[PDB]
Amino acid sequence: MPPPADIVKVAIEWPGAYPKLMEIDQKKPLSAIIKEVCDGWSLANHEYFALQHADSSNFYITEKNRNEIKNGTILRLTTSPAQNAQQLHERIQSSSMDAKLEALKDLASLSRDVTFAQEFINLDGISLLTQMVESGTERYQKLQKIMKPCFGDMLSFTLTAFVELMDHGIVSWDTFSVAFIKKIASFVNKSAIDISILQRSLAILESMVLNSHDLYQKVAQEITIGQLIPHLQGSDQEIQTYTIAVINALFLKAPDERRQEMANILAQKQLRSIILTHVIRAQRAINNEMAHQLYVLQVLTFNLLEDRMMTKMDPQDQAQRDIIFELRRIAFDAESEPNNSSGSMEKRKSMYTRDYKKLGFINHVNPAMDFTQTPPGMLALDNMLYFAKHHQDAYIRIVLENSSREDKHECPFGRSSIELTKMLCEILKVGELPSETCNDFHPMFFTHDRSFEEFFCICIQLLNKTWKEMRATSEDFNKVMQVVKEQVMRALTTKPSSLDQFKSKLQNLSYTEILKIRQSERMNQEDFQSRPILELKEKIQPEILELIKQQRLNRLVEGTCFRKLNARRRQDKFWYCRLSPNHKVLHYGDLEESPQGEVPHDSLQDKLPVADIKAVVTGKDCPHMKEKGALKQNKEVLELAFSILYDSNCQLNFIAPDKHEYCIWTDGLNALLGKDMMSDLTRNDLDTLLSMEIKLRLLDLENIQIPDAPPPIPKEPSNYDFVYDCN
Amino acid sequence: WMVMNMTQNRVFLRAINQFAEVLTRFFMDQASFELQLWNNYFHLAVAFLTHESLQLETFSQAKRNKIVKKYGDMRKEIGFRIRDMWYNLGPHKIKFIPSMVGPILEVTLTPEVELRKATIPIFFDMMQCEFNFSGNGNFHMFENELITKLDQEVEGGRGDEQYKVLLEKLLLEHCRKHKYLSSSGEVFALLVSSLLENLLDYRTIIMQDESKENRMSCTVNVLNFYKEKKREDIYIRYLYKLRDLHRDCENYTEAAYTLLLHAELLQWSDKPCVPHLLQRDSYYVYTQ
Amino acid sequence: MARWIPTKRQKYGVAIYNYNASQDVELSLQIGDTVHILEMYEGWYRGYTLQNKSKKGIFPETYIHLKEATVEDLGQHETVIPGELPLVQELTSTLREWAVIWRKLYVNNKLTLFRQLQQMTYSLIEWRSQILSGTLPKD
């Protein structure tokens, strides 16, 4: 039974006055709330007060967004919107410049509400603004040279207000006049405008292009390719995004013939080269808007190819016959004599059949039957034209290679090209509306105006090389498709810079080395610190440390040659301290010089109670090193100090040869007390043991992602009824 | 080439199986002549049986998994063939005794359970056959060397205790399957099991730290069993071991006691008819 | 824990991390805890863990990565390239043997042989990760 929520706490602030507390119920209509507020505060004229949110939004209470009210939130009382609109209208024609400035600033800041915008427009605000703009053309000219900054700022605020009003769509389409377009054009024509003014003008232009198509023609009448290029010279990324977006808007609702014309204009100006030398080489904060610009320019290039490739090439075209005749002449000038150029069509058909029986073509009477399917259609013809123009050596090599295929696995060029084009269209998502969230960008599209063709050429050359290496058969079409899709995805994810460098890096990439190194780095970071991975190894540590201590004890059992203290005057310096196979007693004492090692026998001091050993002091706490007479130890053996303290009056101080076995001995001594290890050798072994065990156990999750959040617990039946018998 | 070894053993199993089938085909009771070949037959069968066992493959479980996946255990069907051949052979077990006592021990002390469970009743069958043969007297002359070979097996390191419990359960079952001779059978088998746990303690303490009292109790128990069964060979060798250990602990009084035991169990006959009291370390006249 | 159906499309029971101790038979499961499950349920799977094949362990479907692959990876076309996943499974057996190898290699100090074995196993796991997915020509 939840407690009632009809009681809430909220403070209503005032400018310069401290708040007052009252309970407000949002279920009741706002009129009732206002009446109750007026009754509580004894305030008349209930229609002259309203409510607003004092948060960062600074918005009034609305019927659709009133749930943002939360207990313990600052809220201040404001004047009613009608009074605010009235005072703003009165101060529009006031005699104070500062009053106009602040009123316009407040109006622009508080123009994010729709219903109050409707209320303000109901007072013929739009008509008044239009009249003051039309009559203000020559009014501000006298004081323009005096207060250009403030006037420009107010103009920018007014433009923002108009933009948001258009976004809400309150203003009718027919209400737009040519005066606004003329004013924007005049602002653009001015050579003393700021970058912000230019950005606002270009935003207005792109919005107008989005509005209609005739206005787009009107603005294109005053668009030159030589003025938007100086805009690219500015290193600012935002202005580049705006200019590219307007350029795309030029390609949205224009005839395809004019699309080709302006594409040719861009090519003759070589826009992509200056784009590469300006925005591609920039290492600043690349915008997601810039990524959208790259994607939409890629789509524009795709459409400029499609509007010429979407059509079907008629097989009955004699001009097409002549074009393919010249193409096959410049391609197959090894098997076909040069004299057939002036020959008859019978030799043409003979060459057709003899050169298509080796290229996997079935029909030899109508060779142009395979040209009625788009994509690509005539695009492959342009590709082979380019191959003959630039790659004539490779063209002749391929021509003499495909016909020389003696493995009975000749690849049909047309079918492979069609399949690759279909795969590229599928992966690149050609024919779909632009996404509102995805911001993928490929910097290789601006290297050339024909960058898609160059990418296709690189892809087909790589595929030909890979197929030559593999010598594939007819049973791995799925393998070919999946491998080409994966390699294209991997190439695009690398974000290449130059076509030659991209092609070199295609072969330079190893066999999934990046994935392996990323997995290793992630595993190392998780082992250092992680929530869902690190706890796995430390959770299970009962056996590794136990076996480490067992190994240390075995090292104690086998034993070695020990050293005594102050062996100077006919005193032995080598002896043994061997642990019993029961791991309970120590055999040690004064022994002779045994080069072989330990001598298995009973020593002088055969008993060493391990159940009464307090601890083993390490370092300078050894009593034997504190000698003040003649038995002082050397300073170089400070790292070899360890004494098994017992009986509180006698000490068994042993001397180690060097550091590693001293650490082994102290590890054994600490394991005898059932404590942690204190050895550099052990920590070296400790890390590799756990790492090796985890490396062994991670095999089951190979090729499978490991979720980080704990998986849920689905419900189970309460009964233990076994449909299938156990065991 | 352990795979070569196992294929060789598989074909050896095939060869032994076809030998058994041809023996059953033409060497039944009517072929009562030249029956000595069965001794070498079963000697070869046991020698083949006594390798590639559980402890051989026990190093890693994967080896056991793969071998049971591809071939399965072979010693099991080896024991099955041995037991069915013994069942179908006939009443001629009397001649087998001095030869069959030894080899059956290895399959007797097998680490597994199921095959030994199926093989145990061969002991009841041979005991009843031995009684049928030796009703004109006693039948100790099997248990004597049975104990000898059991001692040798445990000294080889193949003793077990839950196996002793299983042995006792099975022999109680077989005695309940039998008549008044069940009492003698079960008391002798209780002696056998007590001696077996004696040697189990001896072997499980000879590897641990020396204590020198539990081993002494176990050894005096084996001496009691041997003097109870009128057997001296294992008795004299074990008192020799006692005397060596007592020399190690400079205890002359118990050494004198054991020497008196040897003297009182040694007759005044001056002809060394039984050569077991001699020592095989050297070779000379060794006159008594 | 009712409605359990025999199935053979779950021989590769993939864990995630140390499973919760809500179930007594279940402990902090390791990464490579393959469960040879013989019973099927919509959201839970109880089968024999590789660590203890004689002990059942109930594992949620969300904790189990769906692996229809059996020991034979050619019947269900699981192999990325035919005749290669038998190599990966025998390599898994080899690594499960490497487990006891390193478990025994510390009882007796074989430092030179141990170090060279470490290098060999490092190269082995590198190559196993490289050939986790078959995408190279037959040579």
A711 close contact with C: CB closer than 8 A = yes
CB-based contact (8 Å) between C115 and chain B? no
Chain A residues near residue C134 by CB distance under 8 angstroms? none
DSSP structure class, residue A14? E
Q: In DSSP terms, which residues pair with B246 in a beta bridge? A: none
**Strand order across the beta sheet in which A650-655 lies:** A615-618, A641-646, A650-655
* Whole-number Å distance between alpha carbons of A384 and A549: 74
Instruction: Using only the alpha carbons of chain B, give its radius of gyration.
Output: 22
Number of B–C residue contacts, CB under 8 Å: 6
Asked if residues A474 and A409 have their Cβ atoms less than 8 Å apart, the reply is yes
Angle at A49 between CA A45 and CA A52, to 5 degrees: 170
3-state SS of A445-460? HHCCCCHHHHHHHHHH
User: Which chain A positions have a beta carbon within 8 Å of C121's beta carbon?
Assistant: 692
Task: Please state, in angstroms and rounded to a whole number, the distance separating the CA atoms of residues B73 and B53.
Answer: 9
Dihedral Cα B47, B52, B53, B59, nearest 10 deg: 150
Looking up tokens 């072979």, which residue turns up?
A: B74
Task: Compute the distance between CA of residue A641 and CA of residue A578 in angstroms, rounded to an integer.
Answer: 19
For residue A375, cis peptide bond before it (omega within 30 degrees of 0): yes
The SS3 call for residue A60 is strand
List, edge to edge, every strand of the sheet that includes A17-22: A17-22, A10-14, A75-76
Cα–Cα distance, A39 to A50 (Å, whole number): 14
- C30 at interface of A, judged by CB pairs closer than 8 A: yes
Helix (H) or strand (E) holding A492: helix A477-493
3-state secondary structure of A605: strand
What are the backbone dihedrals phi and psi of residue A267, each rounded to the nearest 5 degrees, phi first? Answer: -65, -40
Q: Is B208 on the interface with A (CB under 8 A)?
A: yes
Neighbours of A48 (CB within 10 A): 13
Residue of C nearest to A699 (CA): C32
Of A516, A701, A724, the CB nearest to C39: A724
Please list every residue in chain B whose beta carbon sits closer than 8 Å to the beta carbon of residue C52: none
Query: Judging by beta carbons within 10 Å of its beta carbon (0-12, 13-18, 19+), is residue A10 exposed, middle or buried?
Result: middle
Residue A286 region, left (φ>0) first, then alpha (ψ -120 to 50), else beta? beta
> Which residue is it, tokens 């060779």?
A367
Helix (H) or strand (E) run with residue A501 in it: helix A499-508
Residue B3 to chain C, least CA–CA distance (Å): 17
Pairing of strands A10-14, A75-76: parallel
Nearest Cα of chain A lies from the Cα of B208 at a distance, in angstroms, of 8
Angstrom distance (rounded) from CA A240 to CA A202: 11
Cα–Cα distances (Å) from B39 to B19, B24, B45, B102, in that order, read 14, 15, 10, 11
Q: After which residues is chain A broken (C to N over 2.5 A)?
A: none
CB atoms within 10 A of CB A99: 13
Residues 6 or more apart in contact with residue B250 via CB below 8 angstroms: none
In the numeric block, which tokens belong to residue A280?
Answer: 């591609």
What three-state secondary structure class fits A432?
A: coil
- Helix B37-49 crosses helix B75-89 at what angle (to 10 degrees)? 160
- DSSP lists the bridge partners of residue A20 as A12
Query: Which residue from B153, C62, C16, C79 is spatially nearest to A533, judged by alpha carbons?
Result: C16
- Asked if B100 and B147 touch (Cβ cutoff 8 Å), the reply is no
Tokens 């919509």 — which residue?
A: C42
Helix or strand or coil: residue A20? strand
Resolution (Å units): 7.0
CB contact under 8 Å between A699 and C65, yes or no, is no
Nearest C-alpha neighbor of A366 from the set A403, A406, A331, A324: A324
Nearest-angstrom CA–CA distance, B178 and C12: 55
Chain B residues within an 8 Å CB radius of A581: 209
CB under 8 Å, gap of 24 or more: what pairs does A228-234 form?
Answer: A229/A269, A229/A271, A229/A274, A231/A198, A232/A274, A232/A275, A232/A278, A232/A279, A233/A278, A234/A195
Backbone angles phi, psi at B178, to 5 degrees: -120, -170
Instruction: Give yes or no for a cis peptide into A376 (omega within 30° of 0).
Output: yes
| Helix A81-92 vs helix A114-121: crossing angle, to nearest 10 | 50
E-assigned strands of A531-589? 561-562, 575-579, 586-588
Q: Please tell me if residue A4 touches chain C, with a CB cutoff of 8 Å.
A: no
Q: Say yes or no: C100 contacts chain B, CB-CB below 8 A.
A: yes
| Closest CA in chain B for residue A584 | B209
A468 token code pair:
């030559």
| Cα gap A10→A205, rounded to integer Å | 47
Distance from CA of C8 to the nearest CA of B (A): 18
> Which residues lie below 8 Å from residue C3, measured CB to CB, with a gap of 6+?
A717, A721, A723, C41, C42
3-state SS of A86-140 is HHHHHHHCCCCHHHHHHHHHHHHHCCCCHHHHHHHHCCCHHHHHHHHHHHCCCCC
Name the H helices within A365-412: 379-390, 392-402
Q: What is the DSSP string of C85-132?
A: HHHHHHHHHHHHHHHHHHHHHTTTT-HHHHHHHHHHHHHHHHHHHHTT
Q: Which helix (H) or strand (E) holds A421?
A: helix A413-428
A583 CA to chain B: closest CA distance, Å? 11
Using the structure block, give the residue that is written with the tokens 């130890």: A633
Can you spell out the DSSP letters for C31-94?
TT--EEE--B-SSEEEEEESS-TTSEEEEETTTSB-----S-STTTT--SSTTSHHHHHHHHHH
Mapped onto helix, strand or coil, the DSSP state of residue A616 is: strand
How far is B59 from chain C, CA to nearest CA, in Å? 9
Q: How far is A550 from A310, CA to CA, in rounded Å?
A: 78
Question: What is the torsional sign of CA A327, A328, A332, A336?
Answer: negative
**Is there a contact between A187 and A177 (Cβ–Cβ < 8 Å)?**
no
Cβ neighbours, 10 Å, residue B200: 17
Q: Write out chain A residues lying below 8 Å of B209, CB-based.
A: 580-582
To the nearest 10°, the Cα dihedral for B125, B126, B131, B133?
Answer: 120
Q: CA A650, CA B12: separation in Å to the nearest integer?
A: 70
Q: Do B229 and B241 meet the contact criterion of CB atoms below 8 Å apart?
A: no
Looking from the CA of B4 toward its CB, the CA atoms found within 13 Å total 1
Question: Does residue C50 contact residue C35 with C-beta atoms inside 8 Å?
Answer: yes
Cβ count within 10 A of residue A671: 21
Strand partners, A79: A49
A609 torsion bin: left (phi>0), alpha (psi -120 to 50), beta (else): beta
Contact predicate B286/B278, CB 8 Å: yes
Q: In whole angstroms, what is the distance from residue B114 CA to residue C18 CA?
A: 39
Q: Chain C residue closest to B66 (CA)? A: C93
All partners of chain C with 3 or more CB pairs under 8 angstroms: A, B
Do the chains contact at C17 and A696, CB–CB below 8 Å? no
Q: Which residues contact C115 (CB under 8 A, 6 or more apart)?
A: none
Kindly report the backbone phi and psi dihedral angles of residue A561, in degrees, each rounded to the nearest multiple of 5, phi listed first.
-85, 125
- Between CA A572 and CA B153 the distance in angstroms is 49
CA distance A688 to A704: 24
CB contact residues (below 8 A), chain A span 504-533, against chain C: 511-512, 516, 519, 532-533
Let me know if A695 is exposed, middle or buried by CB neighbors in 10 A (0-12, 13-18, 19+). middle
- Enumerate residues 6+ apart whose C-beta is below 8 A from A117: A111, A165, A168, A170
Mutate to test the interface with B, among C50, C100, C102 (most CBs of B within 10 A): C100
To test the contact with chain A by mutation, choose from B208, B209, B210 the residue with the greatest count of A C-beta atoms within 10 A, namely: B209
Q: What are residue A475's phi and psi, to 5 degrees? A: -105, 5
Nearest CB among A516, A688, A717 relative to C3 is that of A717
Quote the CA–CA distance of A487 and A462 in Å, as a whole number: 10
Nearby residues of A424 by Cβ (< 8 Å), 6 or more positions away: A430, A456, A488
DSSP letter, residue A629:
S
* Closest approach of B17 to chain A, Cα-based (Å): 34
Whether residue C77 lies within 8 A of chain A, CB to CB, comes out as no
Strand, coil or helix: A653: strand
Query: Which residue of chain C has the CA closest to A552?
Result: C107
- From A527, A676, A713, select the one nearest C22 (Cα to Cα): A713
Distances (CA, A) of A230 to A192, A505, B36: 15, 34, 116
Q: Could you tell me which of A440, A326, A311, A465 has the C-alpha nearest to residue A374?
A: A311
DSSP chain B: -HHHHHHHHHHHHHHHHHHHHHHHHH-SGGG-SSTTHHHHHHHHHHHHHTSS-HHHHTT-HHHHHHHHHHT--SHHHHHHHHHHHHHHH-STTTTTHHHHTTHHHHHHT-S-SHHHHHHTHHHHHHHHHHHHHHSSS--HHHHHHHHHHHHHHHHTT---SHHHHHHHHHHHHHHHTS-THHHHHHHHHHHHHHHHHHHHHHHHHHSS---SSHHHHHHHHHHHHHHHTT--HHHHHHHHHHHHHHHHTT-HHHHHHHHHHHHHTS-S--S--SGGGS-SSS-S----
Q: Which residues contact B276 (CB under 8 A, 6 or more apart)?
A: B232, B233, B236
Beta bridge partners, A40, equal none
Backbone torsions φ then ψ of A605, nearest 5 degrees: -105, 90
Supply A194's token pair: 């700021």
The SS3 assignment for A17 reads strand
Strands A575-579 and A75-76: unpaired
Q: Which residue's entry shows tokens 């040694």?
A: B266
The CA distance from C137 to the nearest CA of chain B, in Å, is 32
Under 8 Å between Cβ of A44 and A38: yes
